[PDB]
Design a protein around this ligand. Structure first.
Ligand code: SAH
Ligand code: SAH
Ligand code: MG
Ligand code: MG
Lengths: 219, 219
């Protein structure tokens, strides 16, 4: 439906201004054959505000892409704050690095290249946590296991956000053949069973396909 | 539409459990001849999570109705925490008081029966602030002025949430003659012009009509 796109433009015209660095991060996707699946401008503003509510000094992100979400959240940090972002595809990591450098965030953002499931245990061994806010936005089948590692890297009060857990309502389909839909359903079931967090799922509409984000606070 | 309602039920089954006090607050509406306009269960859980992220000890609410939103937020408070809620309709205030008593929240929730525009300057005279979180959800035309009073009762980092600021996308109609739509448009314009806060509007779908909430953090 057109109405959600029109209302998103109305909102971003008021409260979703994008500077050159964010517009250049979006423009970088097509040039590198990367999917146009960044958070929307209004979702970026929302993640920035959540980071401010957390008084975030240390943020962990799974799934960098071009660093669009990364720039929004890193801009909530104090100058001595750090965002670690994990990216499997070396092409995406190099594009994201250029975009972070253009944004003047080189000293605040560490891009680690590799599988999230390989790097998360390294972060625990290094004592990189606890993170004030964790954004889970990589491949979807392992969301459930990514959340278990996120808890190992959390403090009481840590906010864990997981993107793309509604998928146009396809999570209602118990017989879905789509691995990302199966991954979201398994993650959502895990969150429903979890005693370590208070959580909800926010349905989200706008310029992107109908979807949702899970928000979880570590008790 | 049906999909948004079905997905809302899926989410509330996982993460939106309502105890007897919440269900009794909902049931009180039809018995009392009150409009069925409480926040949804999943919106209630979201407000509770935001109050936890604020580490709220002092909460202000405009517009109590039967106290449904009030119960969700007051349950985030520590035992020495307080929520002040403003309700113009003495019948609504009496119904909310019974519902708050049933929830065991009598000691922590103060219902003030009168117009918010009359009571807000009383709270300033009393030094009742600052509030960690403010929920604006009363009559719609004066939302703009309620927000100015909310800033007078805020600290740096206060979260201000305003419900019902999208109204099924009717805020796109500059020629709307509906008081609630004009109130939302004027508030949204104020919010886009306001240099005292960082803010967004979240589009919302689910069991209620397509709408949205404004979220603002005081600088
Ligand atoms: N196993 C894995 N570990 C880490 N990153 C992975 C991964 N599998 C996929 N990814 C990456 O996850 C990303 C998902 S898109 C991330 C979008 C970004 N958070 C934004 O909103 O701007 C892609 O860059 C993809 O390459
Ligand atoms: N001037 C005013 N001052 C305070 N409350 C007002 C008001 N005008 C209307 N109201 C009240 O605002 C309420 C709007 S409905 C509030 C719903 C409630 N927050 C919930 O989600 O559960 C009604 O109870 C109405 O009586
Ligand atoms: Mg995503
Ligand atoms: Mg309302």
């Amino acid at each position: 439906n057109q109405i959600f796109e029109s209302v998103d433009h109305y909102i971003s015209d008021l409260l979703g201004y994008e500077d050159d660095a964010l517009l250049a991060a979006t423009n970088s996707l097509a040039e590198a054959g990367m999917p146009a699946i960044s958070v929307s401008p209004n979702q970026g503003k929302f993640l920035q505000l959540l980071a401010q509510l957390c008084q975030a000094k240390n943020i962990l992100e799974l799934g960098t892409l071009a660093g669009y979400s990364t720039i929004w959240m890193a801009r909530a940090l104090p100058k001595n704050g750090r965002l670690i972002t994990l990216e499997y595809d070396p092409k995406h990591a190099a594009v994201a690095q250029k975009n972070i450098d253009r944004a003047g965030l080189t000293s605040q953002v560490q891009i680690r290249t590799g599988k999230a499931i390989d790097i998360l245990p390294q972060l625990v061994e290094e004592g990189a946590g606890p993170f004030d806010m964790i954004f889970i936005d990589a491949d979807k089948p392992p969301y459930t296991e990514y959340f278990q590692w996120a808890l190992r890297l959390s403090r009481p009060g840590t906010l864990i956000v997981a993107d793309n857990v509604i998928r146009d309502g396809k999570v209602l389909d118990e017989n879905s053949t789509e691995p990302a839909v199966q991954g979201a359903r398994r993650f959502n079931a895990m969150l429903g069973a979890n005693t370590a967090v208070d959580a909800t799922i926010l349905q989200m509409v706008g310029v992107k396909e109908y979807d949702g984000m899970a928000l979880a606070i570590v008790k």
